[PDB]
């Protein structure tokens, strides 16, 4: 087998698209490995750039292709560099730019923690003939800085894994498992946008929809609460704006459903109160006396969700 | 004729676009077939990667092109591998990534069951000179896991079909039918998103638009019901958001039209009730007595649609 | 001159974009023509696939380029096949996929009938040296089936036309007119989507905006009619959603303007009625007596438009 | 210097995008020029198509590259034709398709007049070694017909200009000015869409918001005028839909701001009128007597803008 | 080391996308450097255009690749020119078109000042073998003119920087720092669009929501203020339209939150006023006496933000 040493440089991470579960990675790929010695002009290694590497491959150079597994489309390679040493180590450099896609789990969406994964494999050389020795990661341009809505934490977590591909069994019986390089880039979201943008105006709308309880006329109790109920229902599709069509709820989702329950229970309580007014002049007191206990109850449900879910 | 053995690996299915009737498939193609024996260096098969397969084709190697029928655009191939055995079997490997399009039928949209089809054909070699022997499918990375709004069930269903192309009749009279590989990937949707997102707030709006019947003043009976009627009409275009401009209705569509009928019959009943008030003080009882029977009627229409349609 | 026989296969029509006046066509191109005889291995015609046709062109083969006139961008060709017969007929096959654009006329939009046109020309060979003999069309996969909002009727209508290009006059004086292949694919829209989706809720809104005439209080006559008037105005941009910024009106457009006239005349009639109430207690009868005659009038305007326009 | 004769054919203009200031042009490029005589087979000029022009360039043919200046991206060339005459004139043909971008000035947007400009330059040959003799334009397929929202007027206006490029001064001291071909295609918009689509419903809304002055109750004067004021404010973003984020106003913009002034002055006048009602029963007459003079005033402001601006 | 002189021409800047933090740059690249002398036909330098530069590279010409660091995707190069002098200076010309991305800081968004940065580096040649001598910038076509929402100020600010790349340490121990060309293009936004488009209608809405204080009936004080409050809340997402999901607020954001505070404090003050009405007939004076002091207070908060923030 042949040892391979890979060094990775990450330029910038951008274009994180939760709707399509994609994100874009910029950087360079450097693969170092050792072969037979050769002769170079001078005692200095040879520089072979693009539209000249193919000529040396046609001469008989062995340059394996190292693909990326978790990409959509094709890695948009730029220039590519081949470095040839007389002593017998061959170094291939290229600038990738890939649109990477991976699984994400949005349970606690405003305060979520994700990771970016990079999965690299040789295309046709198994570890019995091409082994990845080690990788050292270079993340310094994005080491501690904020992506447009995500914060970065710490260094990269890396691992090389060996995975079996059963679909080569008819064409390569026993040696069909591949050395795979896996790199993790941890990332945490900034809650700040949603905190100043949605949970605040919703908070004011909930407060006004509670303050409607202090009124003393029936039309003011119903019509304003109805308009507020419909406009609160109109904010159901905020999660679908940023995220996909997720089968599970978030804090915005759970909060807005709790708001729905509050306003619907309020309008049912008012209707039941008027139905208890048999003559239209007998006044109930206990049924609107909930101005101070149930706000503590709603904050209690909120703090139970906060304590248990965190 | 020449036998061909194809083994298929499916990496991931994503980007299911019901609006354009497209979906994206990642994976690898492996075609195995047997020809004349040859000479290789060593007793080990030769590895010929990209920008070197064309040289061996120019040497006289017979590598047929196996296209995909049901794609939009072109399959975005990546690297391609040619495996050459001295004993006389030639194995071609390539990584496809295609945007696949096929028919879909959205009668029962929230609870629908679809399948993904892959249709492959050689470009110019009929089965009298190129026969597909068999295919074995490899679906393990996506064997039992949820696509972003679709669930996967079971293994792949495969079939090889032989179809006649009449447009080669002027250029190839009798032998113009092609061996086609067909692979089915069954998929079932998750109703969960729409269940928590749309049928619930619509349910609360219908319940409030019914609870308006318990009021005792004319302006409250009309104005709130009118605003609720217009906002219920405003949710007509929800199906057009996810789906296309379909000629047929769904459960959201049938439910929202039933809601339209309920609110329009309610407002007509209220107007007819006031017209029966000849003096403006004579009160009707039978015309608003439908508070308990017609909700059972609406649930009856719903359960009839549920029982008969399922 | 040289005869050319072209046979066309159409795979599927999709992606009809009325906003950009584009549509996508899938299929294969087959051009058959006769030249000088040659020598082949065996008595069987030679199969020359892609990345090998260029070598035979460099050998001295005459393969003309047959472009498409009415495309946007470039035809996304796939594989291409060259068929070489010893007796002297050369057959070129390729899989096109083009985004085709042509004129459309949307006078009667919900019930419109269009056609898809395919315009093909050789790039540089006039009919004095390259003549199109005939074409036979192959439309069987889409022969009788519904495109996502269009129905297909009958077979293809074809014609070969000879058109003069005056811009070669400085470079080719007398022989500058080109043989052009024209294929028509008739298509009719399905009215069903718009029939269940827009003309129905608009019908209910118009009916409610008429039923407001049966009320007996001024505020109920004005405020509800005003809200309904503004929401009917809000549906002006439905045509701009599907279609472009058309200089002419459709049935949705004419219907919604008729609705505008109805609601604006109604609110002016109510204001004029209240102005005729000099003391605020004198009641008019003739000015609201139009509950039964003018609905017949509005249906009369509708049926006049239906009878005359159809 | 070398004379060059260019003849231009324009196929169709489409995809005019005011938001990105782009438009798409289809057509062919024909460049005719005279060089040294040569030998051809027969007495007939040689036809050299694509993937064969490069071989003759490698033979020593001088084919300059004629780029387009005002494009975004790259001109999507199709086939390219080289015509070789024995007498010594070389004719290059190619089918371009470019996305062209240029300045536009939207002062009087609904009734605007623009022009399409085509700017062509050789890439590296100045007029001391490559001179453009003349151009004759061929616009017949689009000579008098309507683009989807633009009308075409007259023939093309052309000019060849010689412009200095100062950035070659370090590499070519004295001879660094380039012969540039400039073609103008005048175009005028059709006001019809906006005339039937926006200025009409806005006209009805303004008329209703004036007709609110004829009412006799305070709540009807305020609430309806408030809802109409907010929905008129809601139509502020119509210009941003079609156009960009322009620093200057249009007729829709000026009209909607005039509407804003009318409704805001009306609501301030009503509030001031009620404040002049000291006892709540004393009635003002002069403050609502403006039903007939200020509509003439608003039409006067409109006709002043029409007369002065046109 | 080898000196390199680079001259840059900028054609046009367009497509500034704050949502994706991208912008597009058009222009040409010219690199001048001196090598060994050679022989040319005549005493005039040789013109080598595209699809001929690669042949001279294969002959043994040393043409380094000068990439751009801060691009997304790949620079869409057009034609490329090589200029060869007999005396020994080699000049490479090419037309780039890149989508450039860089950091932006939107604290004071309507009145912001940004700069466009261009970062260029050789791909594999460090300054010990390739040194950038100097750069002279050519910005004349866009020297003083307005980009579609940005104004340009002054000349370009340029600097050449030398940056260490630690990821070549395993492959090149001591000499791994690269000469980088950095060009700054200062740009200032035009506040005019937002000034006439959003801060004006919001100003009228705030003025009407203040003028509601002059009314004398409870329903008019509540219902209109409630509808205005909800529609003011509805304009929260204006910043998200142009900008991204920013963690920090702007002047539109701070102004709209101040409006939220004004309307919510107003509705709470009205509710508290009615609660102070113990009998429903006792009238408060001090609680609505804030018609003249708190508008001065709101303008005071605005002018404090204006003075301190500027
Ligand atoms: Na009311
Ligand atoms: Na209302």
PDB file of N, CA, C and O in Angstrom, chain E residues 148-204:
ATOM      1  N   UNK E 148     -26.166  51.782  -9.425  1.00  0.00           N
ATOM      2  CA  UNK E 148     -27.622  51.790  -9.306  1.00  0.00           C
ATOM      3  C   UNK E 148     -28.173  52.119  -7.920  1.00  0.00           C
ATOM      4  O   UNK E 148     -29.303  52.601  -7.807  1.00  0.00           O
ATOM      5  N   UNK E 149     -27.402  51.861  -6.852  1.00  0.00           N
ATOM      6  CA  UNK E 149     -27.727  52.474  -5.570  1.00  0.00           C
ATOM      7  C   UNK E 149     -26.485  52.885  -4.779  1.00  0.00           C
ATOM      8  O   UNK E 149     -26.582  53.116  -3.569  1.00  0.00           O
ATOM      9  N   UNK E 150     -25.326  53.013  -5.425  1.00  0.00           N
ATOM     10  CA  UNK E 150     -24.101  53.405  -4.741  1.00  0.00           C
ATOM     11  C   UNK E 150     -23.377  54.489  -5.519  1.00  0.00           C
ATOM     12  O   UNK E 150     -23.320  54.455  -6.751  1.00  0.00           O
ATOM     13  N   UNK E 151     -22.799  55.437  -4.788  1.00  0.00           N
ATOM     14  CA  UNK E 151     -22.007  56.518  -5.359  1.00  0.00           C
ATOM     15  C   UNK E 151     -20.531  56.191  -5.194  1.00  0.00           C
ATOM     16  O   UNK E 151     -20.138  55.570  -4.201  1.00  0.00           O
ATOM     17  N   UNK E 152     -19.717  56.610  -6.157  1.00  0.00           N
ATOM     18  CA  UNK E 152     -18.282  56.363  -6.102  1.00  0.00           C
ATOM     19  C   UNK E 152     -17.562  57.658  -5.723  1.00  0.00           C
ATOM     20  O   UNK E 152     -17.961  58.754  -6.132  1.00  0.00           O
ATOM     21  N   UNK E 153     -16.540  57.532  -4.881  1.00  0.00           N
ATOM     22  CA  UNK E 153     -15.745  58.645  -4.374  1.00  0.00           C
ATOM     23  C   UNK E 153     -14.267  58.411  -4.636  1.00  0.00           C
ATOM     24  O   UNK E 153     -13.703  57.406  -4.195  1.00  0.00           O
ATOM     25  N   UNK E 154     -13.651  59.347  -5.356  1.00  0.00           N
ATOM     26  CA  UNK E 154     -12.210  59.412  -5.467  1.00  0.00           C
ATOM     27  C   UNK E 154     -11.598  58.308  -6.306  1.00  0.00           C
ATOM     28  O   UNK E 154     -12.264  57.570  -7.035  1.00  0.00           O
ATOM     29  N   UNK E 155     -10.280  58.208  -6.192  1.00  0.00           N
ATOM     30  CA  UNK E 155      -9.507  57.208  -6.906  1.00  0.00           C
ATOM     31  C   UNK E 155      -9.449  55.912  -6.113  1.00  0.00           C
ATOM     32  O   UNK E 155      -9.990  55.799  -5.010  1.00  0.00           O
ATOM     33  N   UNK E 156      -8.787  54.923  -6.699  1.00  0.00           N
ATOM     34  CA  UNK E 156      -8.589  53.650  -6.025  1.00  0.00           C
ATOM     35  C   UNK E 156      -7.442  53.740  -5.029  1.00  0.00           C
ATOM     36  O   UNK E 156      -6.435  54.407  -5.274  1.00  0.00           O
ATOM     37  N   UNK E 157      -7.597  53.053  -3.905  1.00  0.00           N
ATOM     38  CA  UNK E 157      -6.527  52.910  -2.932  1.00  0.00           C
ATOM     39  C   UNK E 157      -5.935  51.516  -3.074  1.00  0.00           C
ATOM     40  O   UNK E 157      -6.659  50.521  -2.992  1.00  0.00           O
ATOM     41  N   UNK E 158      -4.630  51.448  -3.290  1.00  0.00           N
ATOM     42  CA  UNK E 158      -3.967  50.189  -3.570  1.00  0.00           C
ATOM     43  C   UNK E 158      -2.848  49.917  -2.573  1.00  0.00           C
ATOM     44  O   UNK E 158      -2.300  50.836  -1.958  1.00  0.00           O
ATOM     45  N   UNK E 159      -2.545  48.633  -2.397  1.00  0.00           N
ATOM     46  CA  UNK E 159      -1.447  48.190  -1.550  1.00  0.00           C
ATOM     47  C   UNK E 159      -1.086  46.766  -1.936  1.00  0.00           C
ATOM     48  O   UNK E 159      -1.960  45.965  -2.264  1.00  0.00           O
ATOM     49  N   UNK E 160       0.205  46.457  -1.898  1.00  0.00           N
ATOM     50  CA  UNK E 160       0.699  45.103  -2.103  1.00  0.00           C
ATOM     51  C   UNK E 160       1.136  44.572  -0.746  1.00  0.00           C
ATOM     52  O   UNK E 160       1.941  45.207  -0.058  1.00  0.00           O
ATOM     53  N   UNK E 161       0.600  43.416  -0.360  1.00  0.00           N
ATOM     54  CA  UNK E 161       0.880  42.846   0.947  1.00  0.00           C
ATOM     55  C   UNK E 161       1.511  41.473   0.785  1.00  0.00           C
ATOM     56  O   UNK E 161       1.286  40.774  -0.204  1.00  0.00           O
ATOM     57  N   UNK E 162       2.311  41.095   1.776  1.00  0.00           N
ATOM     58  CA  UNK E 162       2.994  39.810   1.804  1.00  0.00           C
ATOM     59  C   UNK E 162       2.474  39.003   2.985  1.00  0.00           C
ATOM     60  O   UNK E 162       2.696  39.379   4.140  1.00  0.00           O
ATOM     61  N   UNK E 163       1.791  37.895   2.700  1.00  0.00           N
ATOM     62  CA  UNK E 163       1.074  37.126   3.714  1.00  0.00           C
ATOM     63  C   UNK E 163       1.642  35.711   3.760  1.00  0.00           C
ATOM     64  O   UNK E 163       2.009  35.147   2.724  1.00  0.00           O
ATOM     65  N   UNK E 164       1.745  35.157   4.966  1.00  0.00           N
ATOM     66  CA  UNK E 164       2.300  33.828   5.195  1.00  0.00           C
ATOM     67  C   UNK E 164       1.204  32.778   5.099  1.00  0.00           C
ATOM     68  O   UNK E 164       0.151  32.913   5.728  1.00  0.00           O
ATOM     69  N   UNK E 165       1.457  31.732   4.318  1.00  0.00           N
ATOM     70  CA  UNK E 165       0.571  30.579   4.239  1.00  0.00           C
ATOM     71  C   UNK E 165       1.240  29.407   4.942  1.00  0.00           C
ATOM     72  O   UNK E 165       2.210  28.841   4.428  1.00  0.00           O
ATOM     73  N   UNK E 166       0.717  29.048   6.109  1.00  0.00           N
ATOM     74  CA  UNK E 166       1.317  28.015   6.937  1.00  0.00           C
ATOM     75  C   UNK E 166       1.063  26.608   6.422  1.00  0.00           C
ATOM     76  O   UNK E 166       1.702  25.667   6.903  1.00  0.00           O
ATOM     77  N   UNK E 167       0.158  26.436   5.465  1.00  0.00           N
ATOM     78  CA  UNK E 167      -0.188  25.094   5.019  1.00  0.00           C
ATOM     79  C   UNK E 167       0.785  24.528   3.997  1.00  0.00           C
ATOM     80  O   UNK E 167       0.666  23.350   3.645  1.00  0.00           O
ATOM     81  N   UNK E 168       1.745  25.314   3.520  1.00  0.00           N
ATOM     82  CA  UNK E 168       2.821  24.785   2.695  1.00  0.00           C
ATOM     83  C   UNK E 168       4.029  24.360   3.514  1.00  0.00           C
ATOM     84  O   UNK E 168       5.061  24.017   2.933  1.00  0.00           O
ATOM     85  N   UNK E 169       3.923  24.384   4.846  1.00  0.00           N
ATOM     86  CA  UNK E 169       5.086  24.136   5.694  1.00  0.00           C
ATOM     87  C   UNK E 169       5.598  22.710   5.560  1.00  0.00           C
ATOM     88  O   UNK E 169       6.807  22.479   5.653  1.00  0.00           O
ATOM     89  N   UNK E 170       4.703  21.749   5.343  1.00  0.00           N
ATOM     90  CA  UNK E 170       5.140  20.372   5.146  1.00  0.00           C
ATOM     91  C   UNK E 170       5.749  20.176   3.763  1.00  0.00           C
ATOM     92  O   UNK E 170       6.556  19.263   3.559  1.00  0.00           O
ATOM     93  N   UNK E 171       5.373  21.016   2.799  1.00  0.00           N
ATOM     94  CA  UNK E 171       5.831  20.813   1.431  1.00  0.00           C
ATOM     95  C   UNK E 171       6.862  21.848   0.992  1.00  0.00           C
ATOM     96  O   UNK E 171       7.605  21.601   0.032  1.00  0.00           O
ATOM     97  N   UNK E 172       6.933  22.993   1.664  1.00  0.00           N
ATOM     98  CA  UNK E 172       7.939  24.016   1.384  1.00  0.00           C
ATOM     99  C   UNK E 172       8.252  24.706   2.704  1.00  0.00           C
ATOM    100  O   UNK E 172       7.476  25.565   3.155  1.00  0.00           O
ATOM    101  N   UNK E 173       9.377  24.365   3.336  1.00  0.00           N
ATOM    102  CA  UNK E 173       9.570  24.684   4.760  1.00  0.00           C
ATOM    103  C   UNK E 173       9.664  26.163   5.102  1.00  0.00           C
ATOM    104  O   UNK E 173       8.930  26.639   5.972  1.00  0.00           O
ATOM    105  N   UNK E 174      10.548  26.904   4.443  1.00  0.00           N
ATOM    106  CA  UNK E 174      10.865  28.254   4.883  1.00  0.00           C
ATOM    107  C   UNK E 174      10.307  29.340   3.975  1.00  0.00           C
ATOM    108  O   UNK E 174      10.091  30.464   4.441  1.00  0.00           O
ATOM    109  N   UNK E 175      10.036  29.037   2.709  1.00  0.00           N
ATOM    110  CA  UNK E 175       9.650  30.056   1.732  1.00  0.00           C
ATOM    111  C   UNK E 175       8.220  29.766   1.275  1.00  0.00           C
ATOM    112  O   UNK E 175       7.974  29.179   0.221  1.00  0.00           O
ATOM    113  N   UNK E 176       7.251  30.214   2.073  1.00  0.00           N
ATOM    114  CA  UNK E 176       5.853  29.918   1.787  1.00  0.00           C
ATOM    115  C   UNK E 176       4.950  31.128   1.998  1.00  0.00           C
ATOM    116  O   UNK E 176       3.772  30.978   2.324  1.00  0.00           O
ATOM    117  N   UNK E 177       5.476  32.336   1.827  1.00  0.00           N
ATOM    118  CA  UNK E 177       4.667  33.541   1.930  1.00  0.00           C
ATOM    119  C   UNK E 177       4.558  34.208   0.567  1.00  0.00           C
ATOM    120  O   UNK E 177       5.526  34.233  -0.198  1.00  0.00           O
ATOM    121  N   UNK E 178       3.374  34.737   0.275  1.00  0.00           N
ATOM    122  CA  UNK E 178       2.963  35.069  -1.079  1.00  0.00           C
ATOM    123  C   UNK E 178       2.775  36.571  -1.216  1.00  0.00           C
ATOM    124  O   UNK E 178       2.284  37.226  -0.292  1.00  0.00           O
ATOM    125  N   UNK E 179       3.180  37.111  -2.362  1.00  0.00           N
ATOM    126  CA  UNK E 179       2.943  38.516  -2.653  1.00  0.00           C
ATOM    127  C   UNK E 179       1.521  38.717  -3.156  1.00  0.00           C
ATOM    128  O   UNK E 179       1.122  38.164  -4.183  1.00  0.00           O
ATOM    129  N   UNK E 180       0.756  39.525  -2.429  1.00  0.00           N
ATOM    130  CA  UNK E 180      -0.664  39.704  -2.687  1.00  0.00           C
ATOM    131  C   UNK E 180      -0.932  41.150  -3.065  1.00  0.00           C
ATOM    132  O   UNK E 180      -0.481  42.073  -2.387  1.00  0.00           O
ATOM    133  N   UNK E 181      -1.686  41.339  -4.143  1.00  0.00           N
ATOM    134  CA  UNK E 181      -2.090  42.660  -4.600  1.00  0.00           C
ATOM    135  C   UNK E 181      -3.475  42.949  -4.053  1.00  0.00           C
ATOM    136  O   UNK E 181      -4.398  42.151  -4.241  1.00  0.00           O
ATOM    137  N   UNK E 182      -3.620  44.086  -3.377  1.00  0.00           N
ATOM    138  CA  UNK E 182      -4.885  44.488  -2.785  1.00  0.00           C
ATOM    139  C   UNK E 182      -5.278  45.859  -3.322  1.00  0.00           C
ATOM    140  O   UNK E 182      -4.479  46.798  -3.279  1.00  0.00           O
ATOM    141  N   UNK E 183      -6.501  45.965  -3.834  1.00  0.00           N
ATOM    142  CA  UNK E 183      -7.022  47.197  -4.418  1.00  0.00           C
ATOM    143  C   UNK E 183      -8.322  47.527  -3.707  1.00  0.00           C
ATOM    144  O   UNK E 183      -9.172  46.649  -3.537  1.00  0.00           O
ATOM    145  N   UNK E 184      -8.482  48.780  -3.286  1.00  0.00           N
ATOM    146  CA  UNK E 184      -9.701  49.221  -2.618  1.00  0.00           C
ATOM    147  C   UNK E 184     -10.442  50.219  -3.496  1.00  0.00           C
ATOM    148  O   UNK E 184      -9.836  51.149  -4.036  1.00  0.00           O
ATOM    149  N   UNK E 185     -11.750  50.025  -3.628  1.00  0.00           N
ATOM    150  CA  UNK E 185     -12.628  50.924  -4.365  1.00  0.00           C
ATOM    151  C   UNK E 185     -13.674  51.427  -3.385  1.00  0.00           C
ATOM    152  O   UNK E 185     -14.632  50.709  -3.072  1.00  0.00           O
ATOM    153  N   UNK E 186     -13.508  52.655  -2.909  1.00  0.00           N
ATOM    154  CA  UNK E 186     -14.441  53.221  -1.947  1.00  0.00           C
ATOM    155  C   UNK E 186     -15.792  53.485  -2.601  1.00  0.00           C
ATOM    156  O   UNK E 186     -15.868  53.846  -3.779  1.00  0.00           O
ATOM    157  N   UNK E 187     -16.863  53.296  -1.833  1.00  0.00           N
ATOM    158  CA  UNK E 187     -18.218  53.495  -2.327  1.00  0.00           C
ATOM    159  C   UNK E 187     -19.127  53.960  -1.199  1.00  0.00           C
ATOM    160  O   UNK E 187     -19.033  53.468  -0.071  1.00  0.00           O
ATOM    161  N   UNK E 188     -20.014  54.900  -1.510  1.00  0.00           N
ATOM    162  CA  UNK E 188     -20.976  55.431  -0.551  1.00  0.00           C
ATOM    163  C   UNK E 188     -22.378  55.265  -1.128  1.00  0.00           C
ATOM    164  O   UNK E 188     -22.584  55.414  -2.337  1.00  0.00           O
ATOM    165  N   UNK E 189     -23.322  54.893  -0.273  1.00  0.00           N
ATOM    166  CA  UNK E 189     -24.684  54.642  -0.715  1.00  0.00           C
ATOM    167  C   UNK E 189     -25.417  55.966  -0.891  1.00  0.00           C
ATOM    168  O   UNK E 189     -25.011  56.988  -0.335  1.00  0.00           O
ATOM    169  N   UNK E 190     -26.458  55.957  -1.723  1.00  0.00           N
ATOM    170  CA  UNK E 190     -27.377  57.084  -1.835  1.00  0.00           C
ATOM    171  C   UNK E 190     -28.574  56.851  -0.927  1.00  0.00           C
ATOM    172  O   UNK E 190     -29.346  55.919  -1.166  1.00  0.00           O
ATOM    173  N   UNK E 191     -28.780  57.671   0.110  1.00  0.00           N
ATOM    174  CA  UNK E 191     -29.942  57.507   0.992  1.00  0.00           C
ATOM    175  C   UNK E 191     -31.293  57.774   0.342  1.00  0.00           C
ATOM    176  O   UNK E 191     -32.313  57.579   1.006  1.00  0.00           O
ATOM    177  N   UNK E 192     -31.311  58.208  -0.920  1.00  0.00           N
ATOM    178  CA  UNK E 192     -32.475  58.883  -1.481  1.00  0.00           C
ATOM    179  C   UNK E 192     -33.681  57.961  -1.608  1.00  0.00           C
ATOM    180  O   UNK E 192     -34.799  58.369  -1.262  1.00  0.00           O
ATOM    181  N   UNK E 193     -33.474  56.726  -2.090  1.00  0.00           N
ATOM    182  CA  UNK E 193     -34.576  55.774  -2.257  1.00  0.00           C
ATOM    183  C   UNK E 193     -35.345  55.558  -0.968  1.00  0.00           C
ATOM    184  O   UNK E 193     -36.570  55.703  -0.935  1.00  0.00           O
ATOM    185  N   UNK E 194     -34.637  55.210   0.099  1.00  0.00           N
ATOM    186  CA  UNK E 194     -35.303  54.915   1.356  1.00  0.00           C
ATOM    187  C   UNK E 194     -35.912  56.171   1.953  1.00  0.00           C
ATOM    188  O   UNK E 194     -36.998  56.106   2.538  1.00  0.00           O
ATOM    189  N   UNK E 195     -35.269  57.321   1.719  1.00  0.00           N
ATOM    190  CA  UNK E 195     -35.779  58.598   2.202  1.00  0.00           C
ATOM    191  C   UNK E 195     -37.128  58.942   1.582  1.00  0.00           C
ATOM    192  O   UNK E 195     -38.022  59.443   2.272  1.00  0.00           O
ATOM    193  N   UNK E 196     -37.302  58.698   0.286  1.00  0.00           N
ATOM    194  CA  UNK E 196     -38.616  58.977  -0.278  1.00  0.00           C
ATOM    195  C   UNK E 196     -39.573  57.798  -0.184  1.00  0.00           C
ATOM    196  O   UNK E 196     -40.781  57.995  -0.351  1.00  0.00           O
ATOM    197  N   UNK E 197     -39.087  56.595   0.115  1.00  0.00           N
ATOM    198  CA  UNK E 197     -39.913  55.404  -0.006  1.00  0.00           C
ATOM    199  C   UNK E 197     -40.434  54.856   1.310  1.00  0.00           C
ATOM    200  O   UNK E 197     -41.567  54.378   1.343  1.00  0.00           O
ATOM    201  N   UNK E 198     -39.655  54.888   2.384  1.00  0.00           N
ATOM    202  CA  UNK E 198     -40.102  54.240   3.609  1.00  0.00           C
ATOM    203  C   UNK E 198     -40.216  55.170   4.799  1.00  0.00           C
ATOM    204  O   UNK E 198     -41.175  55.058   5.563  1.00  0.00           O
ATOM    205  N   UNK E 199     -39.263  56.081   4.988  1.00  0.00           N
ATOM    206  CA  UNK E 199     -39.303  56.931   6.173  1.00  0.00           C
ATOM    207  C   UNK E 199     -40.414  57.969   6.033  1.00  0.00           C
ATOM    208  O   UNK E 199     -40.910  58.509   7.029  1.00  0.00           O
ATOM    209  N   UNK E 200     -40.857  58.230   4.803  1.00  0.00           N
ATOM    210  CA  UNK E 200     -41.997  59.121   4.612  1.00  0.00           C
ATOM    211  C   UNK E 200     -43.333  58.458   4.950  1.00  0.00           C
ATOM    212  O   UNK E 200     -44.045  58.996   5.817  1.00  0.00           O
ATOM    213  N   UNK E 201     -43.740  57.321   4.340  1.00  0.00           N
ATOM    214  CA  UNK E 201     -45.045  56.750   4.720  1.00  0.00           C
ATOM    215  C   UNK E 201     -45.103  56.318   6.168  1.00  0.00           C
ATOM    216  O   UNK E 201     -46.153  56.447   6.805  1.00  0.00           O
ATOM    217  N   UNK E 202     -43.985  55.839   6.713  1.00  0.00           N
ATOM    218  CA  UNK E 202     -43.918  55.575   8.144  1.00  0.00           C
ATOM    219  C   UNK E 202     -44.111  56.850   8.950  1.00  0.00           C
ATOM    220  O   UNK E 202     -44.763  56.819   9.998  1.00  0.00           O
ATOM    221  N   UNK E 203     -43.569  57.974   8.472  1.00  0.00           N
ATOM    222  CA  UNK E 203     -43.790  59.241   9.150  1.00  0.00           C
ATOM    223  C   UNK E 203     -45.251  59.644   9.176  1.00  0.00           C
ATOM    224  O   UNK E 203     -45.768  60.071  10.211  1.00  0.00           O
ATOM    225  N   UNK E 204     -45.945  59.483   8.043  1.00  0.00           N
ATOM    226  CA  UNK E 204     -47.382  59.753   8.015  1.00  0.00           C
ATOM    227  C   UNK E 204     -48.174  58.798   8.903  1.00  0.00           C
ATOM    228  O   UNK E 204     -49.144  59.221   9.543  1.00  0.00           O
TER     229      UNK E 204
END
